[PDB]
Amino acid sequence: VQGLTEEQRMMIRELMDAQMKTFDTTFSHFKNFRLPGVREEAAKWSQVRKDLCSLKVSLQLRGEDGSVWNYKPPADSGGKEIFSLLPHMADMSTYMFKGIISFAKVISYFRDLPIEDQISLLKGAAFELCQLRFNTVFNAETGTWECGRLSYCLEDTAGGFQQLLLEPMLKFHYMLKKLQLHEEEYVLMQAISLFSPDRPGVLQHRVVDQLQEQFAITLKSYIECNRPQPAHRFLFLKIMAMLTELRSINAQHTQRWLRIQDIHPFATPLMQELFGSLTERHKILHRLLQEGS
Amino acid sequence: GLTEEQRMMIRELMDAQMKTFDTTFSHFKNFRLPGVEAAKWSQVRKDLCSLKVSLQLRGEDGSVWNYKPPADSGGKEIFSLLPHMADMSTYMFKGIISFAKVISYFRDLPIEDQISLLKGAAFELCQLRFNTVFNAETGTWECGRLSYCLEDTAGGFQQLLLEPMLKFHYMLKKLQLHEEEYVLMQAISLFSPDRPGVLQHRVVDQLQEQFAITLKSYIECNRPQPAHRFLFLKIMAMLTELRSINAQHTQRWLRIQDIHPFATPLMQELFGISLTERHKILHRLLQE
Ligand SMILES: CCC[C@H](CC)Oc1ccc(C(=O)OC)cc1NC(=O)c1nnn(-c2cc(OC)ccc2OC)c1C
Ligand SMILES: CCC[C@H](CC)Oc1ccc(C(=O)OC)cc1NC(=O)c1nnn(-c2cc(OC)ccc2OC)c1C
């Protein structure tokens, strides 16, 4: 810990603080979410059916009393069986994104940036910081993202563990979990993703790139000061590689998402703004940035 | 063979059953589902731990929603399924009220004896219908798209067969009764002269004797006589066991209601909570 500059210490101290105050590990305040109800365009339909089959999951909504609802998704047959859990996942991604917005809103280096670069940075890193947070609740053995009450469990396939790791996002979660990262390396990862200066729309490239660098320098140091075991050799460069891969996956799933919205509109109002004057077009985002935490 | 009157007796009952029993439960809509004085509270917790089951809802999409019941905590949790079973009971009671009306023998009775017979026969007729959807292998009442599965209680069939009502369903299902024999049981149960509030005792007793003789005669005629020699008596004993079970669960319901009111308005009438004035809903249902 001392091996880190007092500036670095305070930097991990602020990031971890913002994570605790803005990340709901228990999803306890995740409420009012929708649940599954109790030719050229046809080629587009065929593409979407492959996207959704990779991320087929069952939803286990546990209850304080001890009860457990479990939804087994319908097997694909015709149309819209596939879009059954989509209204829910949209509600849950918005709840996730709102905490990512609040994470950044608490960080000093982010709070001082021009509001149009706060909007643009969050637009580029919303998925990446979401997936990084989801990884912390991912159970590699069960194949479940354990989100407090709700648990999303990967549906068993015929291809087995081999068929799953074909999906880049499922592979990303399994590889990143394998690294057994500390909370500090996750929040530092989330900050290197957030402060990416090459995102579309960022106009303070220098300030953001200078900030990103010091986040990676703090990450390389923390790994040097708190991780001397041989399994963690090249852990930093492994982490940095994964972040580059998450940017690749972020791009893949910005395309899958837009295609689904084209076929079957499902996006919440805020999610439509992620996918589109900056302040004017992103009215809900601008509002939330201005609000307190 | 059966007398032509007896044949017509069965014909009417089977007709009533066909018009008033939704075997797929396809019209059981809008039911409440599980969301997501110290003496009375513990007695109630004892009552509710005997018949724990897991609701399963199956969608047209092929999705399955499964409600595992909440492990007993003796609190608000224990009453999680009551708001639902209260809606199931009402839906079932309304179909039982309707069964009785289709029967000419019941419509002729005085409107006050109709209320009394239904008051004492509603539970029995409900459980008789539930048995026709009971799957003894899977321990599940298959109510069309809803399935209620008796949850393993760690004692296997031993603990369940202890509970007189689960024993009843298993025992009755082993009798492999016909649809005609099920509906005749309902009549024999409905037209019971010893029920509280009856005034035409001889009229009802005579009617129940004619339904029972039809059932006795049906078995002799339409079943290998030597093997099913005592089947009619087996049935009569179960109707009797059901009258005893009716009372136990009529008390469980009153105890569970005083601690926490789950009852729908029609159920409250059924449990005593002029006679035609004390049961105004049920009266309306009988004259519409
Ligand atoms: C359970 C949580 C983790 C798990 C990882 C496999 O997740 C799913 C499970 C199953 C499905 C699914 O098959 O049901 C359609 C979909 C998702 N995952 C998103 O639904 C999703 N994850 N991130 N984002 C997203 C969020 C943004 O704001 C933060 C911005 C852009 C985004 O781009 C896709 C979404 C819509
Ligand atoms: C559909 C499932 C069949 C299975 C057979 C035993 O049933 C249950 C399973 C589980 C439970 C349970 O887990 O408990 C919350 C409760 C019941 N069963 C009643 O809830 C119930 N069944 N019949 N009646 C009733 C009806 C009346 O008029 C029609 C009048 C009085 C009645 O009761 C005294 C009730 C309240």
State the helical fraction of chain A: 55-70%
Total domain units of chain A: 1
CATH evolutionary superfamily of chain A? Retinoid X Receptor
Strand-and-helix sequence of chain A, N→C? HHEEHHHEEEHHHHHHHH
Q: Kindly provide the name of the CATH class of chain A.
A: Mainly Alpha
| Ligand catalogue | the ligand CCC[C@H](CC)Oc1ccc(C(=O)OC)cc1NC(=O)c1nnn(-c2cc(OC)ccc2OC)c1C
Instruction: Report the β-strand fraction of chain A as a percent range.
Output: 5-15%
Computed structural class of chain A = alpha+beta
Indicate the multimeric state.
homodimer
Shape of chain A: globular
Number of strands of chain A: 5
Q: Can you list the strand order of the major beta sheet of chain A?
A: 2-1-5-4-3
**Which CATH-level-2 architecture of chain A?**
Orthogonal Bundle
Protein name (chain B): Nuclear receptor subfamily 1 group I member 2
Organism (chain B): Homo sapiens
GO molecular function, one term (chain B): sequence-specific double-stranded DNA binding
Domain NR LBD (chain B): 5-273
Describe the fold and architecture.
- Chain B: One of its GO terms (cellular component) is chromatin.
- Chain B: Keywords: Activator, DNA-binding, Metal-binding, Nucleus, Receptor, Transcription, Transcription regulation, Zinc, Zinc-finger.
- Chain B: Residues 5-273 form the NR LBD domain.
- With 293 residues, chain A is of the alpha+beta class.
- In chain A, strands 2-1-5-4-3 form a five-stranded antiparallel sheet.
- Chain A has helices at residues 6-22, 40-54, 86-106, 108-111, 115-136, 160-164, 168-178, 183-194, 205-226, 235-263, 269-274, 278-281, 283-290; strands at residues 57-62, 68-72, 138-139, 144-147, 150-154.
- Chain A has a single domain (6-30, 88-139, 160-290), classed as Retinoid X Receptor (Orthogonal Bundle), CATH 1.10.565.10.
- Chain A binds chain B through residues 36-38, 61, 63, 65-75, 77, 80-81, 84, and chain B through 33-34, 36, 57, 59, 61-71, 73, 75-77, 80.
- One copy of the ligand CCC[C@H](CC)Oc1ccc(C(=O)OC)cc1NC(=O)c1nnn(-c2cc(OC)ccc2OC)c1C is lined by residues 51-53, 81-82, 85, 88-89, 92-93, 96, 122-123, 126, 130, 141, 143, 148, 165, 249-250, 253, 270 of chain B.
- One copy of the ligand CCC[C@H](CC)Oc1ccc(C(=O)OC)cc1NC(=O)c1nnn(-c2cc(OC)ccc2OC)c1C is lined by residues 52, 55-57, 85-86, 89, 93, 96-97, 100, 126-127, 130, 134, 145, 152, 169, 253, 257, 274 of chain A.
